[PDB]
Amino acid sequence: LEQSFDNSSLISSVKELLLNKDLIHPSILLLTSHLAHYKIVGSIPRCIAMLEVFQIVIKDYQTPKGTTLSRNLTSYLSHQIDLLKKARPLSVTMGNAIRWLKQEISLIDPSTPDKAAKKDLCEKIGQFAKEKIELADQLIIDNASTQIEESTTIVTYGSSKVLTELLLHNAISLKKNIKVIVVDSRPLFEGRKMAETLRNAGVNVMYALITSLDTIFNMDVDYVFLGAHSILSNGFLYSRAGTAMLAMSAKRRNIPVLVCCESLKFSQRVQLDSVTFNELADPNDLVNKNILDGWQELPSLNIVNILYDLTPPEYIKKVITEFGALPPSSVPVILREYKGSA
């Protein structure tokens, strides 16, 4: 109660909406129970999953009697959004996809016989997942592969989103020597998902933990890469928690820090303090007769966890996006010149 941060209402832990007011798609109930119960995702996996379940929910139209397709679908899809809003708070890859999707719903005209609706929403959202995600990531690979010399190391963090393919490309498709160090954190052990895939493909993975973060950097080490959840308007990064400690340790021990991001993921909002806009994530996960049971019913005890916190832009040497490399203080120029306009 001294800082009162545990009563931050940016997430609501209410569950079990039983209301049959709308036709909630059973696939989207599978998607929400797949997100919120056992988190299998990053950010662009959530974006591709949300996008290819909205694919199915527009393919299964079921239009009402007197309402045109241009006058129902945004409210229907917003009530589809509300279940994910209950499940897990949204990324910017959530938001900059759904507002684009609503803008593309808006420019349809009341003459579609609900047969070309597929041909201008399914194909167009496939062009979205092609353009603003996948070939953009292909440009990320082809832009960041020239900035890695042979026989070096890489320190990623958590589950990567795009640069798993970068490490696989520079490991196998370009055959230059590389020694990836993957480090992750309690409780979402999502660096192991990178470690299984990278070592299954046959690259020198050396897993670690973030508590032992000192002895990684005392080896021969350079080129810390970082997956991003969003990049703010100032230059502050925003990603899975525990990123910023190895960011400040990496800048402290004068070895460079990079962020592989794409122009879909830049955000309009602004913050500079870490615990301001943030997600509380289910404090029963930090236990696994257990070690302790019942932080409740014991007065004066609490268990907190944080998913998201900010590296200051002094630490990131280079944000790379599909247009090119850039200093992190110069992200509003791609907020204004390229995001949305491309």
């Binding site: 954190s185 928690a241 400690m245 930090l286 268990i303 916190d309």
Partner: peptide, 9 residues
């Protein structure tokens, strides 16, 4: 109790 990764925030 904070975890390890949530101490910089």
């Amino acid at each position: 109790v904070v975890p390890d990764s949530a101490v910089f925030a």
